Amino acid sequence: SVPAIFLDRDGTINVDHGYVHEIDNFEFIDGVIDAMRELKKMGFALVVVTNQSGIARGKFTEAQFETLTEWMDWSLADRDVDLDGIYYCPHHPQGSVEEFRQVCDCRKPHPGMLLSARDYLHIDMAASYMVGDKLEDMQAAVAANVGTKVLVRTGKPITPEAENAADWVLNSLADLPQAIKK
Ligand SMILES: [Zn+2]
Numbered sequence: 001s002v003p004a005i006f007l008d009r010d011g012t013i014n015v016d017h018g019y020v021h022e023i024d025n026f027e028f029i030d031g032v033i034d035a036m037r038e039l040k041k042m043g044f045a046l047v048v049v050t051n052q053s054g055i056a057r058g059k060f061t062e063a064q065f066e067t068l069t070e071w072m073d074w075s076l077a078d079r080d081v082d083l084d085g086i087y088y089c090p091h092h093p094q095g096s097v098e099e100f101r102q103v104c105d106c107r108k109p110h111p112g113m114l115l116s117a118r119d120y121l122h123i124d125m126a127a128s129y130m131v132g133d134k135l136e137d138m139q140a141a142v143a144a145n146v147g148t149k150v151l152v153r154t155g156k157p158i159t160p161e162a163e164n165a166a167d168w169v170l171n172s173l174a175d176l177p178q179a180i181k182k
Contacts (some may be wrong), residue, residue: 001124004045004084005176006114006146007036008132011155012110012173013048016133021060023071029154031174036081038177044129045084045121049113051136052088056095065090084121087113108132109139114146129180131157131173140166150176 013168015027017083053061053160069086078167089108106112118125129148130141133155141149142165150175151158151166163169170179 001122002045003043003120003127004047004117004121004123004129005039006128006130006141007046007048008134008137009048009050010153011133012131012152016155019054019059021064021068023068026068026072026073029172029174031172033076033079034083034105034112035174035177036076037079038182040056040081042177046081047085047121047123047125048083048087049108049117049130049140050088051094051108052090053095053107055093056097056100062090062100085117086096087117089113107135108136109143111140111143114140114144118144129176131176133162135159135162135165138162150168151178 007013010020013032014020015029017025020026052065054060055065070163073083089106090100091102091104091107093103117123125145126147128146130137131150131152132145133152138149149167151162151169154172170176
């Protein structure tokens with residue numbers, strides 16, 4: 001089995017401009033590509049796990065999401081970062097788009113996406129890390145037995161409740177390799 005870094009996307013990998021779904025509005029956060037490259041070198045699988053309820057809302061389409069996600073995967077590959085998995089949840093129970101209007105067990109704080117990655121990549125969850133900017137990320141992590149729960153400061157303001165549920169709070173994903181080393 002392998003340890004992993006589970007990664008939210010908006011606010012962790014890219015700047016959260018609100019419902020980001022276009023290549024020209026996708027901005028990698030400073031230092032995160034270098035950090036991802038270092039985390040792979042430290043033995044970790046890298047798995048994106050993202051809630052994308054804007055699809056259920058009709059803020060943008062699944063086609064727009066797929067297009068951006070393919071672009072993002074190639075962009076990282078071209079910079080020597082080969083993501084091991086990419087998981088997303090397009091659902092919302094109040095969704096306007098019928099196809100995605102539902103309750104599910106993949107919408108964080110539900111651990112579904114992390115459990116699916118666990119089984120697909122044979123992940124050692126106790127040895128793994130979840131990195132995000134929201135309470136729901138930390139709650140999905142505790143449910144999935146992720147050993148270390150990490151908040152970053154590059155996304156949504158950290159709430160006391162998110163802080164409570166986290167083990168570590170870092171400035172950004174760029175700080176994670178050094179924090180693990182230490
Ligand atoms: Zn879902």
